[PDB]
Amino acid sequence: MGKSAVIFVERATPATLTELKDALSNSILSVRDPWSIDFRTYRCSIKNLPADVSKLMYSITFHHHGRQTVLIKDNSAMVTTAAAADIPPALVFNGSSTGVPESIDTILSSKLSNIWMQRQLIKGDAGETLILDGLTVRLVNLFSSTGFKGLLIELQADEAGEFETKIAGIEGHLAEIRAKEYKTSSDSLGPDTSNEICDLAYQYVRALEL
């Protein structure tokens, strides 16, 4: 079972990504294609709500994992696809689907706009992915509406035996570059049920919260 972790640095500089790319250059084995990610928050527009019912809904869009959206609310996850190649053949065959769906963000922001309204949008484009010995590291700069926000690091490994050691090593590597205020997370949404992309989205939410 693969494991993943996410570390977000808030006080980063524009050139910190290059600094961390060069500081790891000795162990860098290869480089792969760039990636992107989107992060929306939707708000509840109804006022007759109970106290225990949350008001937000976080939508995370993964571009490299085959164009998939994940909706998060109160530690509850939902995974939607929008590509014609991800459709289970039964739904196509029986007639439950017309074959060319839409992203759930269009549905939230077009038809249900009287229940949910957008509040923010944080984007990340042209990230870099590096293959190290039994590890893959992805770096990207986060841009909000106002401007630069911070640095995002996501780590993924296939063997879970020595994940903590790798996390500690990367933390130390950030330490020599004097990035001392960083928030990390490797939590799991469900102890018994393990879905990789849902756990990744939950870790993103836990890292990016203010």
Partner: protein, 46 residues
């Protein structure tokens, strides 16, 4: 899809060069970690 005789000659020269490079790189890897990331601005004087 090559267009020029000079282009064809350059293509064949590069063919010989990178064929030799591939042969020796395979020789090293079958025994060695090369680097495919480093690019130097100025070629090293012979």
């Amino acid at each position: 899809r090559a267009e020029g005789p000079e282009e064809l000659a350059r293509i064949l020269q590069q063919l010989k060069l990178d064929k030799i490079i591939h042969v020796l790189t395979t020789m090293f890897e079958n025994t060695w970690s090369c680097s495919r990331i480093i690019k130097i601005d100025k070629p090293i004087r012979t």
